Design an enzyme around this catalytic site. Sequence first.
Site, short mmCIF file in Angstrom:
data_model
loop_
_atom_site.label_atom_id
_atom_site.label_comp_id
_atom_site.label_asym_id
_atom_site.label_seq_id
_atom_site.Cartn_x
_atom_site.Cartn_y
_atom_site.Cartn_z
N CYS A 270 33.13 59.96 33.94
CA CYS A 270 34.29 61.04 33.19
C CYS A 270 33.46 61.75 32.48
O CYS A 270 33.63 61.55 30.83
CB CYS A 270 35.23 60.23 33.27
SG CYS A 270 36.05 61.07 34.27
N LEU A 271 32.51 62.71 32.02
CA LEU A 271 32.03 63.30 31.14
C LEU A 271 32.12 65.18 31.80
O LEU A 271 31.43 65.08 32.89
CB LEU A 271 30.65 63.41 31.11
CG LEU A 271 30.29 62.91 29.91
CD1 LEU A 271 30.88 61.93 29.01
CD2 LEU A 271 28.25 62.80 29.33
#
Lengths: 147, 985
Positions: free
Chosen positions: A84-85
């Site tokens: 989750c970037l």
Amino acid sequence: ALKRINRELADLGKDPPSSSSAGPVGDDLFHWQATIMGPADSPYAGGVFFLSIHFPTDYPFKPPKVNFTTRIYHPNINSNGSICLDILRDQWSPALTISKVLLSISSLLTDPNPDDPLVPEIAHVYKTDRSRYELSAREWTRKYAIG
Amino acid sequence: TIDEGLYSRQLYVLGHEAMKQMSQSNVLIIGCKGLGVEIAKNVCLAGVKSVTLYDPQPTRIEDLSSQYFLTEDDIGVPRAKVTVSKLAELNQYVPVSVVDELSTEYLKNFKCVVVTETSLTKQLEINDFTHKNHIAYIAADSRGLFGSIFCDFGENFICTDTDGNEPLTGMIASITDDGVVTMLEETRHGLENGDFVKFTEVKGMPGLNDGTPRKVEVKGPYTFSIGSVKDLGSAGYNGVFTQVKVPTKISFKSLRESLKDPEYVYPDFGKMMRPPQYHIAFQALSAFADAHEGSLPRPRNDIDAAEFFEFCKKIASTLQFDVELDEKLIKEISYQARGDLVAMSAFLGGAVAQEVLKATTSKFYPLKQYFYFDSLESLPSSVTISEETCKPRGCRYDGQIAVFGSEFQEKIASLSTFLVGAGAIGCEMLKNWAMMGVATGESGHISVTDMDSIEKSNLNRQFLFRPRDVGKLKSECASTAVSIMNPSLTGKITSYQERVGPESEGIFGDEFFEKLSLVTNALDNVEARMYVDRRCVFFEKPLLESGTLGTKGNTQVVVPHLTESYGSSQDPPEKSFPICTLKNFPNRIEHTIAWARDLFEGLFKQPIDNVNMYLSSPNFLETSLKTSSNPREVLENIRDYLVTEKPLSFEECIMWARLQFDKFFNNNIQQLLFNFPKDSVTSTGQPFWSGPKRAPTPLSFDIHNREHFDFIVAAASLYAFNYGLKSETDPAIYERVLAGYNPPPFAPKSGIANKDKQELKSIADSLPPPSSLVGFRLTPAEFEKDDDSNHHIDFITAASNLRAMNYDITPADRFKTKFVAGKIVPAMCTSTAVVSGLVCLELVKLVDGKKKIEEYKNGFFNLAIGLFTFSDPIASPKMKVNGKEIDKIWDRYNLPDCTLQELIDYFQKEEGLEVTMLSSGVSLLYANFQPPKKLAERLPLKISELVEQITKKKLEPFRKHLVLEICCDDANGEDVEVPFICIKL
Ligand SMILES: Nc1ncnc2c1ncn2[C@@H]1O[C@H](COP(=O)(O)OP(=O)(O)OP(=O)(O)O)[C@@H](O)[C@H]1O
Ligand SMILES: [Mg+2]
Ligand SMILES: [Mg+2]
């Protein structure tokens, strides 16, 4: 494309990342296998995590696909390795190097963000029972990230 | 009752209400020459109620210069009579008629009146009636490389939508008592001063939730103000604002009034003094025609030019125009009076058809009122253009010879073009080339390639294809149609069915590309455009790129050694949402649609692929166990889809669909609310479910509800299709089966060695061996948006609406779901016509071989607001290499197939550069940091042998060159860019 990829590869070669080591697979420039060392001040201390980086044909105008390979017990990383970037989905700009992405991933490993999680159960454990989260993270990094 | 199977792409531009109002309007078109026939074609494809044609003049030969519904067998017959029959076939819902005589009263039968090829006195007589009776009146004219459009929609025109944009919406962080509305973090509202907004779901200020529009006072990129909300409350938290669009009143002026004091629309700001010149010039043209029995000035005739200029002076004196006449421009208008170009006709026809649609639908901002356009930069300068060369030869190209001459006609007739794609732009390009006589000579040729087949929705903007041709190849049909239009193109056109890509280099190779003259792209994706651009750059061929998007369009020209390529510019990429937003916390319908598409792929496509691959590949399990990310997931899918949950009848399919409904809309939400209760707080003390996160709620299956039943039917039907069963649609069986269902209990779980491999092996051995199942295959579901009988869009719509109901999001209908999930690009016939016209106006510059970069014009336009702009192409960047001027894009190194060591020595000795990286394709042939053993193994090999060894694939027999990317450093260690290498095998 190829020239930018080689520029980034040489920049990694010229200046050692110390905490990271990225390189092409075999002789293909559109598939890299990076390595991340677990931060010392984190439950993942003494762990080696492998990442697969797939450069799109339109690089750097499209984000690379970075996926974890070693299993990790993190609120923002699921079992498929998806990270989750924000800089990899819609905030990507043609001005970010692979070193910056690896540093961002290392910072994420340093401290998770359970307020906007990707694995709700791990985030709930992290928010409520911190000690059990620490124990589970240590067990996972000892079972998967070592040897 | 709109046929959404035919107007699928057009409805995404106009809408249902606009088309409903459009299908009740009558259009009269006076003049059936190239411009008139273009307008009629675009109107017929648009879908107006009916079209009436009025042109009793007998056909002449030169009329074939831009009229593609006329043949040489129709000489001597009125144009309307011979054009109505061919126009009536374009659309079956739009009747086309012909009127022998026109009366003033009769004009009241129509909603819009378009006038072309008519004298000024007749135009005034018509407008004096169509103005006081509230009838839209459009007058168009095309003289050589000049064009004029005039619109008069009445004194009280009502325009509901002025720009064609969707209303602006956004989320609010906080509203102060001074009306200061603030957006969320890094969110730009995009509003402008004077706009109207309405607020909903505002907490703390219920008064703003009424829906009354309020003014906007922009104070910054992230905040604005609405006035005073003192009475309603003190402070408001969260909520959503949505823009409100109000109708506008536009007042026009009649033709007689506007002749004296016109209102110009400027298609280009580099030449702002020209429209006043054209205003006098066209009136003088009309006066000259009326003074010579309707005969326009002869081509490139000096006496007629002098007389026309005298008329221009007389008009400028009479009308008290305080403008100094430009003699050169006016006499140029005089010279090209008899010209008839298909490119100008197409451009003006698209524009005028869009104006007609604006008049009928009361949408978009129209031209107000005069629009004078010219493309005088396209006039050739490398040939002789005089009275002798421009005189008619009694052929169908007289209308073009009158502008360009016979020598340029011979230049055009020997072109060897290559058209990529056969879509709407491809059809328009082929029509223009057929009319212009391209490749009708001895040495000419045309090549068109396209692998797609004709579908029903393509007939709305692709006029070369008919309903009887649905299901056939596009290229063959287009070639046949354009051979019918121009018989001289019999045998001069070659149609392929090949996709232009890396795999087609054996057909479009060196020999194919070394004979072309130019390449025209009619594609719709960026990958193919980039590939064709690279091929043109390598072979140094002119390229013509064109693209459309709804009512917007752009055209670009790539010229060798002059301008930059197509890949040097970057366009906004597609928007992909964060995975965490889609997975758990959506807040818009697009998130739910994306989640539904992923669910469709994961339920009906991936497991079937795994099952089929397991039953075919003998060593699939071992490869998956060490290659796939989740071997356990693969084993579970195979087990479930082979033995555990294999249906035997449709009742079991219904039961499985019900179980999946429970799995995805009732249980996962319960788990999420167990992990994050509705009253939980973040680390900063704020409530968790606030702002971009909306608290979900589980759904209980109610059979009587329409959405639940739709989901059950779609899922069960798709499952039966996967397993090849007999699906049913009668609700009786569904209601009978679903009544006897016992929901398995579910309680959320709180959590709290190498035996896992043993469990995986136990699951694996439980599966039947591949030998036991020979010839047994499961049918995967390949997503197809255009078919309405496969339950794909129905399933996606049902799942998306159910997930929206989970999060209290407003559900969307099947139309918007098909628009979003299918990535449908809105398209129009008018935009296609305009871009084809612009590209064909640039083609005559390319043929003439113009050298200066100021003589070419990239074009952009937006027909929703009547915006046209033209800018010069960007010159190719230069660079300094070893004290020499090198073009970055169009320069290369030509080298033999020497060894790697010899190549390095050549670069070290000649250019004085140290090579550090050399790559070909997607492989790294040589790098400065490789171990010495690898280099010592690779150095004494030739480039071809090196590539064959590294890529593990023999070079194809048709391969004749290699393109190498090389990065090298100078003597001091500074990095210097160099052009690519072209190794000759
Ligand atoms: N790589 C390619 N090589 C050759 N032709 C291509 C390639 N990519 C696209 N095309 C062709 O380009 C044309 C594009 O036309 P267009 O987009 O209007 O049609 P469509 O995609 O079939 O329709 P729609 O988008 O309205 O559903 C199509 O004929 C498609 O076959
Ligand atoms: Mg198609
Ligand atoms: Mg398309």
